[PDB]
Amino acid sequence: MKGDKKVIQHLNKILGNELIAINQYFLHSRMWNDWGLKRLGAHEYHESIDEMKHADKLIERILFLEGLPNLQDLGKLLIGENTQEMLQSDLNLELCATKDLREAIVHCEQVHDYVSRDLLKDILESEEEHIDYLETQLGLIQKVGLENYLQSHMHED
Amino acid sequence: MKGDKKVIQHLNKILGNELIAINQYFLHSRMWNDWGLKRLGAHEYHESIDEMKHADKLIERILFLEGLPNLQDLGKLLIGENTQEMLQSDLNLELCATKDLREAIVHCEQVHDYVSRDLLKDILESEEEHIDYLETQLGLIQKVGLENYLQSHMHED
Amino acid sequence: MKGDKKVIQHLNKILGNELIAINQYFLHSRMWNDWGLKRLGAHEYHESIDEMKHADKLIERILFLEGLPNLQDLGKLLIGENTQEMLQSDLNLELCATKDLREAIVHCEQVHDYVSRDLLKDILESEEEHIDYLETQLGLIQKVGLENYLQSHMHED
Amino acid sequence: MKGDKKVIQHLNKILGNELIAINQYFLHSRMWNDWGLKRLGAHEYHESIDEMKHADKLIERILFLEGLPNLQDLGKLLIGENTQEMLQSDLNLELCATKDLREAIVHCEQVHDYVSRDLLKDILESEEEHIDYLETQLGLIQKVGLENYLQSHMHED
Amino acid sequence: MKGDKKVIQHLNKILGNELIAINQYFLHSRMWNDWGLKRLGAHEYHESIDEMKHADKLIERILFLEGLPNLQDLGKLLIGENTQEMLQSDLNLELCATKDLREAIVHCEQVHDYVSRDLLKDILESEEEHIDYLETQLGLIQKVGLENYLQSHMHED
Amino acid sequence: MKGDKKVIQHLNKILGNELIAINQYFLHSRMWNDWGLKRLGAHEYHESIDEMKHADKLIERILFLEGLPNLQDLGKLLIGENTQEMLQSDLNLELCATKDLREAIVHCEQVHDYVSRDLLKDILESEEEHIDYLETQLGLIQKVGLENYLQSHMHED
Ligand code: HEM
Ligand code: HEM
Ligand code: HEM
Ligand SMILES: [K+]
Ligand SMILES: [K+]
Ligand SMILES: [K+]
Ligand code: NA
Ligand code: NA
Ligand code: NA
Ligand code: NA
Ligand code: NA
Ligand code: NA
Ligand code: NA
Ligand code: NA
Ligand code: NA
């Protein structure tokens, strides 16, 4: 097989994180929709779709490298019970995800798998953009108050 | 006459429920417009129109089955005095309506009037969607506060 | 409250007449459709819709004047059993309606509610147009014969 | 084979009913065209085509369930000698068809073949619409007289 | 009646052959579709439709000639169990059909029914085109092999 | 909570089945793409997307009924090693899925949750269409041979 065994392990680890995020964000989206917070529901749906696209790219890369993609192992979804908790749970997930991404990029560089590194760097940039969004939302709750913040997310853009 | 007599009684009971809802929702709509809560007035107008369309389908079915549509009996309207009472009154009415719809479907199934059952199931789905809307609105009043909730319904979409 | 109490009583009386006409004409429409007299069914549907629009305007005016619109009390629907009887019943209803309208306009003029008077005059003109239609139809039954008259109303325009 | 054997027997019974209706309605259509009653000929042609489409759906379902569609058995056509007999013969056929459809739906429900039930319910709704049309036509012959009724069906819509 | 009695018998015989072909080809079409041989299924559907159009023309001619079209008697459908057998069965049917057509044309010429002859000649040309198609398909099975032939008819044109 | 507790258990069981199918079909799709069987990869991708849409509808219904959607439990994926095993594994999964769907519909009917029944019937129809596709593909491998079947799925439609 052409792929480095540890690269493939790293890519399967990142894929596992994507699978958690897909489901966590999809459920959070539909919870916000059920509550009538449609702007949050829509944004979170798009985050879930973005993670689905990252998972696809990882699966394709693992197969090219002649590894076996692991879609069987689903780690812990941490579903919040209110908007603040859901935003914070998403942020905790992305803090974990970006740490694993950096560790994977280090190893790809070490064994000269520069195309896998580039793939992972693109995912990392996407996850840092999500962190920016999440930190901003939690900050806005403090600046405008929770009731106003939720009011501002009732109606879709 | 081709229709089952108890089917026709059930269809007239549902029709009676639709007639209450048409008038209650239409008056609630115009009360919201009078108060300047135009987004609530618009939504409630459309709920009234939807009930008018259900009444039409029931009337057509009753006549096909050679029954007499009952447009004469108008049950009690429970008109609320403020937004929270109006939403809750609509919700109470829909909970009664869906109970009667389920009882009518049971009977249609028993006598093999499958086309009447299908008509009633479509109405039931519409009324459950209205229950979803109403529970969501009452929840938003709690989450964003009454003053913000009303503010968000001043201007039309 | 800004409205004259007796004006509001008159407007609620007219509204009550509109509510009868809405339902009577809607059922007559669907009866003609069930019988295959689609041109009559279509015309009568449009009369029912026109009365719905008059009811809306009355409700809005009553609320502006700080009265309570009465959508609870539904008077007697007189449903005909054949085309001649249905046309005559509609005409009897409009004869009653136009008398109440004239009495309401007299009172509005007396207390200087000229905007309510104008609203009622517009409804009155609409109801006199319906009387013209109804008298014409009953006259055509005599001039062309009942069978030809019904034949001419089988197919929609 | 995946299909329930009695479900397949019921679907073939309905298919047999569709085959009678296709041929009876097609011949009635062309008889009306021969007589110059082109509006009746056109309507009846479309009824024949609708039955052809139902037969197609039944054939497809039977093959999916691994049964043998029965296009070989053609039951009795009851061809009328004049317009009133042809309409009544079509009505008699539809009353038989809807009885068999209800019996088939009962059995599908009992063995949990819910997709076959749904197919049959859609056919049933179509056949009840045809019953509505036929009863309406026979009623119009009484209301406008036979000669006027036929006159109204000379020219196409 | 204006028509020659034996001409009408011949036209009813041809009509009987069309009714067999309609059903045989329709079922063969849907069998090929069930098997995923969609190009064969589509071609055979169009053959069934073409026979339906021939049946229509025969019915119209028989009625003009003041005969009674026979849509009651359905002869034997010979449904094949695999592609080779279905193609050969269709060919056997067309060999029978074209013989009956030639015999009918002889009789039409004899009694000077030249318009019926022309109608039948047009049907005959259509059936010879179908024979050409069928012989060609059976020849291609021999030239390219059965597996390749079926492969080439999986996907629609 | 408005929902029947066993209805919610059934809806979560179906949701669990959808989650297995999403992942199994997505990986099978990308395995086919890796092997250059792009038409199979495309078809299987669309099957995965369809299951995603069913999962969405189930999640929305569970939340409306005030249950907790279970996106955490992922049952066993049975990933095939070649095309014939992958198709058969998908078929085995769909046979399990339709058994569970029928059991869920039985329960919904018993407790009068007719809107949940209708949702499940629509999913069931989709899964039976997939069974039709899968049985057809396995049949084509037998009819055209494995090498031809795979050749026919190299290039996209
Ligand atoms: C038997 C009771 C009623 C029935 C069956 C009925 C039926 C209908 C139908 C079928 C429409 C057309 C809806 C569409 O296709 O969009 C309509 C429109 C409407 N209805 Fe009713 N209606 C009823 C009573 C009322 C009442 C009591 C009111 C007011 C107090 C009302 C107000 C209206 C208005 C404002 C419209 C829209 C008219 C327009 O097109 O401008 N309806 N109704
Ligand atoms: C097994 C019995 C039959 C089946 C399943 C069948 C099926 C069909 C279908 C699916 C269509 C297309 C309809 C559409 O999508 O609009 C059609 C068209 C048609 N059928 Fe049939 N048919 C059957 C028998 C017959 C018979 C016995 C006749 C005449 C005696 C007939 C006359 C026609 C005609 C004239 C058309 C329209 C053709 C055109 O497009 O010009 N069919 N049929
Ligand atoms: C809870 C599980 C999932 C749900 C509810 C879900 C839901 C959805 C929905 C609703 C769509 C839009 C479909 C449409 O309207 O066409 C979608 C698209 C998509 N999904 Fe999922 N999904 C799930 C898991 C996954 C997984 C695990 C993957 C990949 C391993 C995936 C890959 C994709 C892809 C590639 C798209 C198309 C994205 C695009 O528009 O470019 N999904 N998903
Ligand atoms: K605010
Ligand atoms: K006349
Ligand atoms: K080949
Ligand atoms: Na930020
Ligand atoms: Na005001
Ligand atoms: Na809700
Ligand atoms: Na006049
Ligand atoms: Na003629
Ligand atoms: Na009727
Ligand atoms: Na040839
Ligand atoms: Na490759
Ligand atoms: Na199949």
XYZ file of C-alpha atoms and ligand atoms in Angstrom, chain A residues 33-36, chain B residues 131-137, chain F residues 2 63-64, ligand 9:
15
model
C -35.563 25.126 14.366
C -37.973 23.376 16.767
C -37.578 26.339 19.150
C -38.209 28.915 16.424
C -49.770 23.168 16.949
C -46.028 23.207 16.231
C -46.207 26.908 15.355
C -48.243 27.759 18.459
C -46.084 25.862 20.935
C -43.043 27.482 19.336
C -44.481 30.983 19.772
C -47.394 15.038 23.384
C -38.579 16.812 18.305
C -42.162 17.878 17.549
Na -42.199 23.655 18.102
